[PDB]
Amino acid sequence: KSEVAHRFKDLGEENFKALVLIAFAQYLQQCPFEDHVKLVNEVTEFAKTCVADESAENCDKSLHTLFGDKLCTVATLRETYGEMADCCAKQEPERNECFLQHKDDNPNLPRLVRPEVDVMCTAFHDNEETFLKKYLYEIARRHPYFYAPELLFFAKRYKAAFTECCQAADKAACLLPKLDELRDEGKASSAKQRLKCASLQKFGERAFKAWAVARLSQRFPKAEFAEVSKLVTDLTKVHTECCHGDLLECADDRADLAKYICENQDSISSKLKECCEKPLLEKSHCIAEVENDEMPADLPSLAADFVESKDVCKNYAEAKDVFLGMFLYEYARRHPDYSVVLLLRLAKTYETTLEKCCAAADPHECYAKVFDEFKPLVEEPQNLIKQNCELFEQLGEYKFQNALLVRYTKKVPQVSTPTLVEVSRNLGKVGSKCCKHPEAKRMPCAEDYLSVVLNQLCVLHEKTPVSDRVTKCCTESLVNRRPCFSALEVDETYVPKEFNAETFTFHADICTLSEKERQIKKQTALVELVKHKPKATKEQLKAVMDDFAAFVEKCCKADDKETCFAEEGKKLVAASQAALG
Ligand SMILES: CCCCCCCCCCCCCC(=O)O
Ligand SMILES: CCCCCCCCCCCCCC(=O)O
Ligand SMILES: O=C(O)[C@]12C[C@H]3C[C@H](C[C@H](C3)C1)C2
Ligand SMILES: O=C(O)[C@]12C[C@H]3C[C@H](C[C@H](C3)C1)C2
């Protein structure tokens, strides 16, 4: 057997060459692109020898062996990576483990600049393969733990955006939003992978299994508990392995679970047919994104099994996690309109009540009201969504963002201005996205996107802590994270930042910036204004922002923009200072 031949045949040459590029860029993060292209060509040539004849020299070696051997042939391995060259002195599997240990998650490479649209469209046009591959390389070496097939899926979407937009009348008006959306989707995917892994370390496999029970049950509600339970057990093993970070082992684990699911469609879901006709590379991806199946009609209420039955405490006590899993399965499959975390809150509530009540002489009487305890937990996120979507509709995206900016600056004014801006804007984007869903779809959508916004915040904060309240929210159970953040109040102890005239000076270019860059400059100033006058009322802030808008309208219409911005700017600042007192 030749695993390399098998992979080449299953993936196809184009996918194989792209995944080899990613694999090498993620380990050899400092080698130039042209060196990688040469590694990829040599691996591909060799793979083709194996495709032609699985008995040919070296074709029977394992992928790990061949990949390691290839890394160890890199002439500059010691000069560039130091310790990582010491990996070559090991045999397998120690060698591969040593390579994994020496990938660098923060590699100190310059930020990837978005060039001008015409520059990008010209290069895309002039050498499409090089254009796309080089950026694949740039991103992969900066995100060495990003799962390589997912990276490849994104690359195909980028390729599609350039293909469409570079042939359009207004290239920029077509392309830039598509790049913005793909940037966000990429970061959401990246953050979800990090979430799952840190969660698995920080909270244990039990927590992750509860999450999976809830999510799979919503997705595959016609599946029986034992089937959901098997998928949960395998999914946990898969995520366990993928977090260890060996791409091949992770891929085999994912492909095995995808094969299982596809051979078992009739006992899992009616929505999988399309996914299960895809080639191996895309199958597991497609399954992970499948829409929820329709739930069975005429499912009974949970009262009989979970409250009224004389056997609740007996069934619970004999196998606690199994019985709670059943509860979560039954609740989730009936509620695809709930967030996963909401379902976990309800399961945790159910658990807390059984633990208390099953020790009493009359358990039945003590847990008789447990379903009533669920009502306020469900209503809290439904009501927050309703209120936020109504506010979003009244204000529009930009002013909604500004309302959040003001409120979150007052809550946690120690956070850096850029972070407050980025978070507030992203929360507004969650509003945009999720408020276009009907009520039924709103809570899962908000959970997913908020999870990435709050994670991006928590990552920043953990690297540069500024607030004990934020620390607490970021380090609590991920279940309680969003309610802990919702419980934040205005900071009563904060000392106003001292006035700085430069902070509130604006220049003529603001008139001609993109809407996004103009917005970010205004939002920055708004945060600074709140940090300076954290007790300003909504009326007072609105008066200042209205003057600002008048000021920008007047100076952007003026002939001599530099002097208007300077002179009208000084008048604005002085007036505003006297208003806010
Ligand atoms: C503030 C921007 C988001 C727009 C929608 C409001 C979000 C409300 C939180 C919904 C609950 C998410 C999941 C949960 O914690 O149960
Ligand atoms: C201390 C007073 C100096 C502040 C002067 C005016 C500050 C401008 C407010 C920030 C931008 C408003 C946002 C907007 O309306 O788009
Ligand atoms: O494997 C593939 O087909 C490819 C490999 C690269 C270049 C181009 C666009 C993306 C990324 C998918 C083709
Ligand atoms: O700015 C962005 O979002 C990016 C930055 C680089 C890499 C990739 C494709 C292009 C160029 C746009 C993402």
Side-chain angles (χ1 to χ4, degrees), residues 14-16 18 128 132-133 136 152 155-156 159:
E14 291 299 322
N15 289 327
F16 174 100
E128 184 184 302
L132 291 166
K133 288 314 179 63
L136 194 57
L152 182 56
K156 295 173 176 176
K159 178 176 178 176

Tab-separated table of all heavy atoms in Angstrom, residues 14-16 18 128-129 132-133 136 152 155-156 159, ligand 3, unseen atoms left out:
chain	number	residue	atom	x	y	z
A	14	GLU	N	-4.716	18.834	-8.114
A	14	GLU	CA	-4.817	20.238	-7.760
A	14	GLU	C	-5.021	20.436	-6.249
A	14	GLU	O	-4.384	21.275	-5.646
A	14	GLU	CB	-5.966	20.878	-8.536
A	14	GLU	CG	-5.706	21.005	-10.017
A	14	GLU	CD	-4.506	21.862	-10.385
A	14	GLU	OE1	-4.265	22.911	-9.710
A	14	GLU	OE2	-3.824	21.484	-11.357
A	15	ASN	N	-5.947	19.708	-5.648
A	15	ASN	CA	-6.135	19.761	-4.219
A	15	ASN	C	-4.895	19.244	-3.480
A	15	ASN	O	-4.521	19.781	-2.436
A	15	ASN	CB	-7.336	18.946	-3.793
A	15	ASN	CG	-8.638	19.585	-4.207
A	15	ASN	OD1	-8.754	20.803	-4.259
A	15	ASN	ND2	-9.618	18.755	-4.494
A	16	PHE	N	-4.264	18.189	-4.020
A	16	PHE	CA	-3.104	17.604	-3.372
A	16	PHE	C	-1.988	18.645	-3.324
A	16	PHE	O	-1.381	18.806	-2.305
A	16	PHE	CB	-2.662	16.325	-4.079
A	16	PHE	CG	-1.394	15.694	-3.582
A	16	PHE	CD1	-1.455	14.600	-2.723
A	16	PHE	CD2	-0.142	16.129	-4.026
A	16	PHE	CE1	-0.291	13.992	-2.272
A	16	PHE	CE2	1.008	15.519	-3.563
A	16	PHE	CZ	0.928	14.434	-2.708
A	18	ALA	N	-2.163	21.935	-3.478
A	18	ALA	CA	-2.558	23.008	-2.577
A	18	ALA	C	-2.409	22.586	-1.105
A	18	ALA	O	-1.950	23.368	-0.276
A	18	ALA	CB	-3.946	23.448	-2.879
A	128	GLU	N	-2.725	33.820	-12.265
A	128	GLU	CA	-3.789	33.533	-11.335
A	128	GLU	C	-3.337	32.535	-10.272
A	128	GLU	O	-3.731	32.658	-9.100
A	128	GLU	CB	-4.966	32.989	-12.130
A	128	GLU	CG	-6.212	32.728	-11.292
A	128	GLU	CD	-7.330	32.088	-12.098
A	128	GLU	OE1	-7.758	32.700	-13.105
A	128	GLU	OE2	-7.757	30.977	-11.727
A	129	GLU	N	-2.569	31.526	-10.715
A	129	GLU	CA	-2.168	30.424	-9.862
A	129	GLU	C	-1.188	30.951	-8.810
A	129	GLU	O	-1.470	30.825	-7.623
A	129	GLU	CB	-1.576	29.276	-10.687
A	132	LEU	N	-2.992	33.386	-6.260
A	132	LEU	CA	-3.764	32.691	-5.250
A	132	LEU	C	-2.875	31.830	-4.351
A	132	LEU	O	-3.165	31.712	-3.170
A	132	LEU	CB	-4.799	31.806	-5.942
A	132	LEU	CG	-5.921	32.542	-6.654
A	132	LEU	CD1	-6.666	31.599	-7.576
A	132	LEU	CD2	-6.852	33.157	-5.619
A	133	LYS	N	-1.853	31.168	-4.911
A	133	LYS	CA	-1.035	30.251	-4.129
A	133	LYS	C	-0.191	31.067	-3.155
A	133	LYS	O	0.031	30.678	-2.022
A	133	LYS	CB	-0.062	29.392	-4.953
A	133	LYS	CG	-0.624	28.266	-5.805
A	133	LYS	CD	-1.638	27.408	-5.132
A	133	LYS	CE	-2.170	26.333	-6.055
A	133	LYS	NZ	-1.133	25.386	-6.492
A	136	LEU	N	-2.274	31.948	-0.335
A	136	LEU	CA	-2.483	30.757	0.443
A	136	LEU	C	-1.284	30.552	1.382
A	136	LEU	O	-1.458	30.242	2.548
A	136	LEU	CB	-2.697	29.599	-0.533
A	136	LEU	CG	-3.261	28.314	0.059
A	136	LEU	CD1	-4.579	28.556	0.764
A	136	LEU	CD2	-3.462	27.247	-1.010
A	152	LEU	N	-8.262	25.675	2.335
A	152	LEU	CA	-8.379	25.432	0.912
A	152	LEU	C	-9.783	25.776	0.436
A	152	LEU	O	-9.952	26.312	-0.665
A	152	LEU	CB	-7.978	23.973	0.642
A	152	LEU	CG	-8.005	23.560	-0.819
A	152	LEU	CD1	-7.123	24.460	-1.675
A	152	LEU	CD2	-7.576	22.127	-0.965
A	155	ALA	N	-9.875	29.496	0.025
A	155	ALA	CA	-9.143	29.912	-1.169
A	155	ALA	C	-10.030	29.828	-2.394
A	155	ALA	O	-9.981	30.720	-3.240
A	155	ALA	CB	-7.869	29.121	-1.376
A	156	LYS	N	-10.867	28.788	-2.494
A	156	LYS	CA	-11.742	28.626	-3.653
A	156	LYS	C	-12.800	29.725	-3.694
A	156	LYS	O	-13.113	30.242	-4.763
A	156	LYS	CB	-12.320	27.212	-3.694
A	156	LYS	CG	-11.214	26.185	-3.902
A	156	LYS	CD	-11.640	24.741	-3.787
A	156	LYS	CE	-10.485	23.818	-4.117
A	156	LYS	NZ	-10.870	22.411	-3.916
A	159	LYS	N	-10.907	32.908	-4.922
A	159	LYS	CA	-10.762	32.753	-6.358
A	159	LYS	C	-12.045	33.138	-7.095
A	159	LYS	O	-11.993	33.841	-8.116
A	159	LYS	CB	-10.405	31.312	-6.715
A	159	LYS	CG	-10.288	31.092	-8.214
A	159	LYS	CD	-9.855	29.723	-8.665
A	159	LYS	CE	-9.857	29.680	-10.175
A	159	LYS	NZ	-9.341	28.394	-10.687
B	3	LIG	O1	-6.892	22.952	-5.568
B	3	LIG	C1	-7.375	23.860	-6.289
B	3	LIG	O2	-8.150	23.647	-7.257
B	3	LIG	C2	-6.989	25.310	-5.997
B	3	LIG	C3	-5.614	25.420	-5.322
B	3	LIG	C4	-5.260	26.897	-5.100
B	3	LIG	C5	-5.233	27.624	-6.440
B	3	LIG	C6	-6.608	27.541	-7.094
B	3	LIG	C7	-7.653	28.177	-6.178
B	3	LIG	C8	-7.676	27.443	-4.843
B	3	LIG	C9	-6.302	27.546	-4.195
B	3	LIG	C10	-8.029	25.962	-5.073
B	3	LIG	C11	-6.962	26.067	-7.336
